[model samples]
Target: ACPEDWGASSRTSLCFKLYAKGKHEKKTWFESRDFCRALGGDLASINNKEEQQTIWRLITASGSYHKLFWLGLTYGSPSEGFTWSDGSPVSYENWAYGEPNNYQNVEYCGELKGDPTMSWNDINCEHLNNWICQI
Candidate 1:
């Protein structure tokens, strides 16, 4: 049965609930994911340009510097590549060249697939930044 207050879009019908920066303290990707899951959602997984655009718009209006933010995509380890937390394969990706470098062999998380706006960058799971959750 359908419920109230759900945000429905094409392909997938979603009902997003958020833990905003001011309302809730910022946290690392893992921490943020925990927060989201506690609220009954998981960290955001942008499957396409439209999804990324939706987030970019808010990021612009969030009144914060356009910097790195966390996504559910993460490397299994320093050796493996990326995968989503929801067990979804990364069918689409938007990475900048010379990235996924696994620099210092420490970066293990995905940054909205990009930092230059709608691109992806590999980062550490412990690095704190804005993160969105999928409902």
Candidate 2:
């Protein structure tokens, strides 16, 4: 069952569904973050090799192929460098070449741009892209 907020105005809205198997839906980057936070979770965070493998498995299990989604990573300030939403420095990176350029001085969120390899891209946080969550 999707949330009541689903189909509401684009802003301050949520789109989620829960069934016997699991839940599925989508939300913009920031909105997904807020929604997950409200649910005592947060945007999915892949911290190590093991977690990366687990995320890959989850992606495949969900049958969600070739769809970009928000991640907990961000690169907002130069002094801060690339950091996770939880304020952890990104020890491992798989960013595309010439990325994190702070394009237009607005790129502050991370997105899984590709699959299998799980390559990612840093993009404008407000750009309204779908995101994943961990509960």
Candidate 3:
């Protein structure tokens, strides 16, 4: 019955769970999107510090390796800006100092990183990493 990872945010009415990591092989963002959809969910979208904090706790508690996971935010170019998969307003953000820098060229996807800021990082979409899913 563990076909899916599920949890509810007691901090908010939102009902979703974070997988923290793959049961086996981690996936790139696109693959992870499909993977979550297959389980009747979508890659997670955290819009507040509380939600992000909650998810991060789950990641660390679950024996996180990278302590980073694909979240559902992507941009076209750095200037193109970011939007949730559902295209919700970019309400809140947490980034490590000098991050969302889109280093080298640019980054299109996001990750919840271990920065003491408890913030998010932007990296190439192709990097295979653990992911969090929400329905």
Candidate 4:
């Protein structure tokens, strides 16, 4: 599919890519996911090695170093373990230290931090942050 034409919105220090794939913008992790859902897309599912690499590349290209963006990964239940919003098992896992603990059981979303070599971290979904969305 062709990349979606979205707008950019500044959230404090960061500027987000909006509606790039469907209809996404800078919001909390949970809000970003919900926004995607409302537009017929999920947070964003990285399904393969190439996809992960591509996402990392995109992050770098966007020049967002040290900042974090939401991904479609979560570990909310033992039975479900690590899963995406689309009901797919996580095929790739790259998390930072002591992550995905749900941060005292309050966190329910993931973020890709750093550039070139991004690492994942599960944080409170309500935490305000910039995000990428599908258009």
Candidate 5:
């Protein structure tokens, strides 16, 4: 069951919260992940279309539109590729066209784009941004 303070996804039964804007100042990817961990969970990990949509809806409801929010995805190495903080396999992806580009070779952390496209993007780990957490 989802917590009362969190958003519940009917399709995937995911319980998530978007910490952004009014709720929290933007934070670096590492900082955001630590916050989630301290809360007894890790950052959100969307494993399928349903879970993706669930997160999208969560962001919409929270009014965190047109922003970037960190996900649990991280590119450790060429061999490991992108993996979630909770140790989930990279089973699903919603990368925007030509994304995970490793743009300028600095983008290693993954984030959920809050645009209408609702796609995923890779960004620099030190860049501050909102984040999603799940339990």
Candidate 6:
């Protein structure tokens, strides 16, 4: 069962809570993960296309326009690939056209781009963004 205050994804059978950037002080990728951990959850990880769409719907419904959001995926260099903070396997991915480029060579964290695509992108861990917690 999902928490009363959290949004439930019927497709994924997961519960998620979103913290808007304006509602709460924006946090860096690392800090955002820690926040979710303190709340007994962790940054959300999309395991499939259904879960990805479900999460994107939640974000759009929340009226968080064009707000970058942190995900549990973290890039540990090219050799290690990306891993979910919740310890899930990287079974599915939705990276934007040419993302995870490690733009400028400092993008070690993954985020959901707030545009229409809601695709994934790699960014610096220190960049501040909104966060989603999943349990």
Scanning candidate 5 in windows of ten residues, the lowest lDDT window is 5-14
Against the correct fold, how does model 1 do in TM-score?
Answer: 0.75
Compare the candidates by lDDT and give the number of the best one.
Answer: 5
TM-score of each: 0.75, 0.71, 0.78, 0.72, 0.90, 0.89
Q: Write the per-residue lDDT of candidate 6 for residues 1-135, one digit (tens) a residue.
A: 677767654543668777886755899998999999998999999898877776777877877678888999897656878999999998898898887798887788899876678789888898788888898
Task: Candidate 4: give the clashing pairs.
Answer: 21-134, 21-135, 22-134, 22-135, 23-134
lDDT of 4 by residue, 1-135 (tens): 333333233332111243322234457766777887887667766666665665666666765466777777766577776678767678777777777776677777787775666678888777666665543
lDDT of candidate 1 over 1-135, digit per residue (tens) = 113433445555544433346425668988987876886768887777776666666566555554566788878754557888877777877886777788898888887632335777887878767777777
Which candidate order results from sorting by TM-score in descending order?
5, 6, 3, 1, 4, 2
Superposed by TM-score, candidate 3 places the C-alpha of residue 103 at a distance from the truth, in angstroms, of 1.1
Best by TM-score: 5
> How accurate locally, in lDDT, is each candidate?
0.69, 0.65, 0.71, 0.64, 0.85, 0.84
| Worst lDDT 10-window in candidate 1 | 1-10
Off by over 4 Å in 1: 1-24, 77-80, 113-116
Candidates 5 and 6: which is better by TM-score? Answer: 5
**For residues 66-114, could you state the per-residue lDDT of candidate 5 as single tens digits?**
8888999889778987889999898888899999899998888999887
**Model 6: residues with Cα > 4 Å off, grouped in runs:** 9-12
**Cα-based lDDT at residue 106, candidate 6:** 77
Model 6 is weakest, by summed lDDT over 10 consecutive residues, at: 5-14
**Candidate 2 — which pairs collide?**
none
Error of 1 at 12 (Å): 4.8
